[PDB]
């Protein structure tokens, strides 16, 4: 919708075959007449390499929305990858939580064994105090 | 002269404050909830009755704004050197291959516990109840569903207003343009 | 499917996800969980729609 | 074919298209719609010939 | 070919110059669009940090027998059920790890208290032995 040569929109857009770009008829024919080169990609171009618009055709269009089956299937896979991305993030969180859970698990088991051994020592010390 | 050091002394207080640092609320992630006193009497067998006091200490912070049940604050306080010494005591005695075995064990055993059950039956694998656990949890799930439906329908009205302003015009213009112009171009 | 629906014969699929079955068997749990997940996805999609407003609609009309 | 540059056609969503069984109802509806278009076009073949 | 992201076989594996790891180009590009930083090293990442690579494609199961084919909804229901179960288990993991953290806090606290008991009782016993 923008022409690189002049910066203005093309009234009659034309697509160059050599390099995909949208030009306007007057300026593109000027640059073709002055030389056989592409003003952007500095490559050989001709009159036939310019492609006018053949939009009309004969077939029946659709609304550009999510109400057509290619579009609707695009929304299908969008829903699917959205719930997939949610599963990805939550599974990262699950594995991180599993790692820290295991760390806390062995820390707590060691702490419980320490508590048991200590309480044994303290029962011994209480017996030693009571020996008198 | 005065404030170049006085404000520094205030920063010194904040530097003494970093040394004093509890946990649980340090990262403030969830909490042992509110219905504290009943669980301690419900405790079987040993450290389940001792975690009572720390849970009662958790109501001192504004988490009690979520709810309050029984309270019964019995804060015993702590000390910085106390915390450090026993951090040493813990990590001096507690070598990575056993941790590899641990991670394998805990992960599997979890996967065995984490069955394809919507409500948590790991305790119910030893208890005897499935229907009422199926009832309370997923009637709360339904209540949150209704709350979410309400807060979304409050935001549906502006969408449907903007949409009778925009997509109604889009569909009307679309049909009138596409059908008439397209079935006329072929006739031409 | 064409030999089927040559007499209309509108194909049927389950829309019974709004009845909100009362406390029952596991089917009630399944419906509640799927409805919750549908609700979360609906929240995300509609808030995403109102992030940009109707600029896309203006471009479609233009 | 040459891949050309286009601003792409924005796809505005209807009032109710947010996953949900709305999407499966639309699945069945567009199935039926394109198939009925096919029937109309086939019988149009037969009548025109 | 063991994809570290979900476990599913990646049809477009990629390599990283800084730290080669199995991802997909579209997903990493989308994440960089969200946050243009390296997730692992916490360093800035650009769009040119990935090198093109060729892939040999895979096969599809292509379910036959064409009978009104409504099973798609049932598979969808199963997918949301699976994600809901996994969310529940996220909740359970968070709750259990916090409970273990709290239990560890009081276990170490009790260790301190009982070691104070030990030192005082041993001092008492040794002093009375000296007496």
Swiss-Prot record, chain A:
It is found in: Nucleus. Transmembrane segments: none annotated. Residues 1-71 form the U-box domain. It comes from the Eukaryota. Probable ubiquitin-protein ligase involved in pre-mRNA splicing. May also function in DNA repair. Homotetramer. Component of the NTC complex (or PRP19-associated complex), composed of at least CEF1, CLF1, ISY1, NTC20, SNT309, SYF1, SYF2, and PRP19. Belongs to the WD repeat PRP19 family. This is Pre-mRNA-processing factor 19. It comes from Schizosaccharomyces pombe (strain 972 / ATCC 24843) (Fission yeast). The lineage of its organism: Eukaryota, Fungi, Dikarya, Ascomycota, Taphrinomycotina. The gene is prp19. The chain holds residues 1 to 132 of 488 of the full protein.
UniProtKB/Swiss-Prot annotation, chain B:
It is found in: Nucleus. GO terms for biological process: mRNA cis splicing, via spliceosome; mRNA splicing, via spliceosome. The keyword Transferase does not apply. Signal peptide: none annotated. One of its GO terms (cellular component) is cytosol. It comes from the Eukaryota. GO terms for molecular function: DNA binding. Keywords: DNA-binding, mRNA processing, mRNA splicing, Nucleus, Repeat, Spliceosome. Involved in mRNA splicing and cell cycle control. Belongs to the CEF1 family. Belongs to the 40S cdc5-associated complex (or cwf complex), a spliceosome sub-complex reminiscent of a late-stage spliceosome composed of the U2, U5 and U6 snRNAs and at least brr2, cdc5, cwf2/prp3, cwf3/syf1, cwf4/syf3, cwf5/ecm2, spp42/cwf6, cwf7/spf27, cwf8, cwf9, cwf10, cwf11, cwf12, prp45/cwf13, cwf14, cwf15, cwf16, cwf17, cwf18, cwf19, cwf20, cwf21, cwf22, cwf23, cwf24, cwf25, cwf26, cyp7/cwf27, cwf28, cwf29/ist3, lea1, msl1, prp5/cwf1, prp10, prp12/sap130, prp17, prp22, sap61, sap62, sap114, sap145, slu7, smb1, smd1, smd3, smf1, smg1 and syf2. Interacts with sde2. This is Pre-mRNA-splicing factor cdc5. The gene is cdc5. The chain holds residues 507 to 707 of 757 of the full protein.
UniProtKB/Swiss-Prot annotation, chain C:
It is found in: Nucleus. It comes from the Eukaryota. Coiled coil: none annotated. Belongs to the SPF27 family. Involved in mRNA splicing. Belongs to the 40S cdc5-associated complex (or cwf complex), a spliceosome sub-complex reminiscent of a late-stage spliceosome composed of the U2, U5 and U6 snRNAs and at least brr2, cdc5, cwf2/prp3, cwf3/syf1, cwf4/syf3, cwf5/ecm2, spp42/cwf6, cwf7/spf27, cwf8, cwf9, cwf10, cwf11, cwf12, prp45/cwf13, cwf14, cwf15, cwf16, cwf17, cwf18, cwf19, cwf20, cwf21, cwf22, cwf23, cwf24, cwf25, cwf26, cyp7/cwf27, cwf28, cwf29/ist3, lea1, msl1, prp5/cwf1, prp10, prp12/sap130, prp17, prp22, sap61, sap62, sap114, sap145, slu7, smb1, smd1, smd3, smf1, smg1 and syf2. This is Pre-mRNA-splicing factor cwf7. It comes from Schizosaccharomyces pombe (strain 972 / ATCC 24843) (Fission yeast).
């Amino acid at each position: 919708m923008f022409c690189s040569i002049s910066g203005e929109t093309p009234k009659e857009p034309v697509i160059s075959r050599v390099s995909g770009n949208v030009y306007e008829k007057r300026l593109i024919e000027q640059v073709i007449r002055e030389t056989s080169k592409d003003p952007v990609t500095q490559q050989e171009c001709t009159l036939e390499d310019l492609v006018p618009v053949k939009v009309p055709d004969f077939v029946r269009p659709r609304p550009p929305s999510a109400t057509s089956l290619p579009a609707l299937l695009s929304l299908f896979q969008e829903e699917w990858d959205s719930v997939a991305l949610e599963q990805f993030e939550l599974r990262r969180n699950l594995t991180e939580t599993k790692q820290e859970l295991s760390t806390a698990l062995y820390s707590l088991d060691a702490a419980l064994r320490v508590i048991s051994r200590l309480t044994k020592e303290r029962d011994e010390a209480r017996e030693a105090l009571a020996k008198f | 002269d005065r404030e170049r050091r006085i404000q520094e002394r205030i920063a010194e207080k904040e530097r003494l404050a970093k040394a004093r640092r509890s946990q649980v609320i340090q990262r403030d992630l969830i909490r042992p909830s509110v219905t504290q006193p009943e669980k301690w009497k419900r405790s079987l067998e040993l450290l389940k009755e001792m975690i009572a006091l720390i849970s009662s200490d958790a109501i001192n912070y504004p988490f009690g704004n979520s709810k309050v049940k029984g309270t019964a604050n019995k804060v015993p306080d702590l000390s910085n050197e106390e915390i450090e010494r026993c951090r040493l005591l813990l990590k001096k005695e507690i070598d990575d291959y056993i941790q590899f075995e641990k991670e394998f064990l805990e992960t599997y055993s979890a996967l065995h516990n984490t069955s394809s059950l919507l409500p948590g039956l790991v305790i119910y694998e030893e208890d005897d109840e499935d229907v009422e656990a199926a009832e309370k949890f997923y009637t709360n799930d339904i209540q949150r569903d209704l709350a979410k439906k309400a807060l979304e329908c409050n935001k549906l009205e502006n969408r449907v207003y903007d949409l009778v302003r925009s997509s109604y015009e889009q569909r009307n213009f679309l049909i009138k343009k596409i059908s008439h112009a397209w079935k006329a171009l072929q006739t031409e | 499917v064409a030999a089927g629906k040559g007499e209309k014969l509108a194909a049927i699929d389950v829309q019974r996800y709004i009845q909100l079955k009362p406390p029952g068997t596991r089917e009630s749990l399944l419906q509640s969980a799927v409805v919750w997940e549908y609700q979360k996805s609906r929240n995300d999609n509609l808030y995403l729609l109102e992030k940009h407003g109707e600029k896309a609609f203006d471009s479609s009309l233009e």
